Amino acid sequence: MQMPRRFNTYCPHCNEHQEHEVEKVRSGRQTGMKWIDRQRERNSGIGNDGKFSKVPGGDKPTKKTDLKYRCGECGKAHLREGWRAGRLEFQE
Amino acid sequence: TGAGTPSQGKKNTTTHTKCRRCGEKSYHTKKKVCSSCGFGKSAKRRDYEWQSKAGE
Amino acid sequence: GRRIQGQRRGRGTSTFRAPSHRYKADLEHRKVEDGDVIAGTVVDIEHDPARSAPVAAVEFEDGDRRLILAPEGVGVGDELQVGVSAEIAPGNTLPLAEIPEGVPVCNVESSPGDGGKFARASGVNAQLLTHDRNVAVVKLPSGEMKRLDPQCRATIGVVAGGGRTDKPFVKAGNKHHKMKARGTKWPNVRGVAMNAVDHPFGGGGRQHPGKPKSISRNAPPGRKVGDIASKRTGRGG
């Protein structure tokens, strides 16, 4: 479906309606220094590594919307519930 | 030839004999080893924890 | 499954061992200080149970009585010589350097003084081709060109008993008698005639290998069977 790049809506920070910019959430890079990372190294040994021997699941036929709504005046973003959408294109 | 009765006829070979060290008829005269006390194999006396129940 | 036959071999049990106690002599070249003043006389010609080929009993000047890997044409009374200055006649042993190029040779040493390793079976021979101060090129019975130290000793002539292979065994019994004199398990049951538990080719409602016969060099023992690292198979192309 189509969707406006910018539009007026509620900003939970400013606490009043203002022009927001919508952007798709870009994946942040992992550091490899989280607890789970240390547990992987620590607990992996001879033979099967339990949970660490598992491999990535599958895919749902359609994914939900993953967006960032940026307040055009205070510059602070907020998140919303996504909805299933095969494709999502921004208008402008 | 049947593996039972008919095969029992050729059994005239002496193997286990009275042991010099323990007195049991377990000294295998062909191997020169007592299957009961270990004579011929070890200076120490043959013994195992599995010869009795674990908590005993 | 169970260990395959090739694995049972390595354990060196009675069934797979050679009847060593029945063998005559370990055929190695004599050791000479230098000079070559070592000659002997052929006293007898005997059968070698380990090679199905004749061997010669020689009595050396210094009282040494030993069996020697006999080339064709050696007989009782003949005088054989071993050393640098040895005459260039059949049956004598001298380093490759003293041997004239183009002369058939047998019982060639791999490393000088090892007593001989190459070309020792019935009727075979190596061909000394090139000389040098550094290397003596010898063509082995397999057709391979082997670079050797000119100091490697060798015997002039082709190995005796040539043509042994020309006659067919004809019957199982003949093979049997020969096999009894070797370190080999015989007869041979085909893998495909066995049960799956006993061989990679065993099993099935009919007889056929359950996969391609060409096996990788890296295959582990118990699995390395069939055509080992075959560069090709068949006859065509």
Binding site: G45, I46, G47, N48 | - | -
Partner: protein, 194 residues
């Protein structure tokens, strides 16, 4: 002023540099031709030996032992085993090489008792350690105030029960506080979790 001994010590801090390096490269050639346990008249590292209890006296013995480098020489499972217990290559023994060396020496001299030991280097495939053993029956030792303690009956086969310095450290008894909950007073009394 510096003791002469301090110089032997300082040399051994870096066995791959200076004169010591050349010494080791020469010695090991002879060592590799020697047996498993070789009694030697004098310690290669005098300072270390004296520091550990050695004395140029009757009943004090020194022997160099060579032990192979690496992990456990282990046989693969011949029956059912869960993946965790199927390993062979990465398994290492719980007793350090120095301790193995000490036991091999004590076995060679059944009447003697292990006092201590130290390293004298290694090549690519083996390590060498010199073990100081003591004759608990010789009167020159039974009368020594510093060594007579080793003559007591409860010190028999001390190396085999881990009562050696290398034994005690390897048993995790070094620390007296945190980390020694399952080591002191013994690995066995703690359920074998040390």
């Amino acid at each position: 002023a510096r003791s002469a001994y301090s110089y032997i010590r300082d040399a051994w801090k870096n066995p791959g540099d200076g004169q010591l390096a050349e010494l080791q490269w020469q010695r090991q050639q002879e060592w590799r031709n020697e047996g498993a346990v070789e009694r030697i008249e004098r310690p290669t590292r005098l300072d270390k030996a004296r520091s550990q209890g050695y004395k140029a006296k009757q009943g004090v013995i020194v022997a160099r032992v060579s032990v192979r480098k690496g992990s456990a020489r282990k046989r693969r499972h011949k029956a059912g085993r869960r993946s965790k217990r199927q390993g062979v290559t990465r398994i290492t023994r719980r007793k350090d090489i120095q301790r193995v060396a000490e036991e091999r020496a004590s076995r060679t001299f059944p009447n003697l008792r292990v006092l201590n030991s130290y390293s004298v280097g290694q090549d690519g495939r083996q390590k060498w350690h010199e073990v100081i053993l003591i004759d608990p029956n010789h009167p020159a030792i039974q009368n020594d105030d510093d060594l007579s303690w080793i003559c007591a009956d409860d010190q028999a086969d001390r190396v085999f029960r881990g009562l050696t310095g290398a034994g005690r450290r390897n048993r995790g008894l070094s620390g007296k506080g945190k980390g020694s909950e399952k080591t002191r007073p013994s690995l066995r009394s703690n359920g074998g979790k040390g």
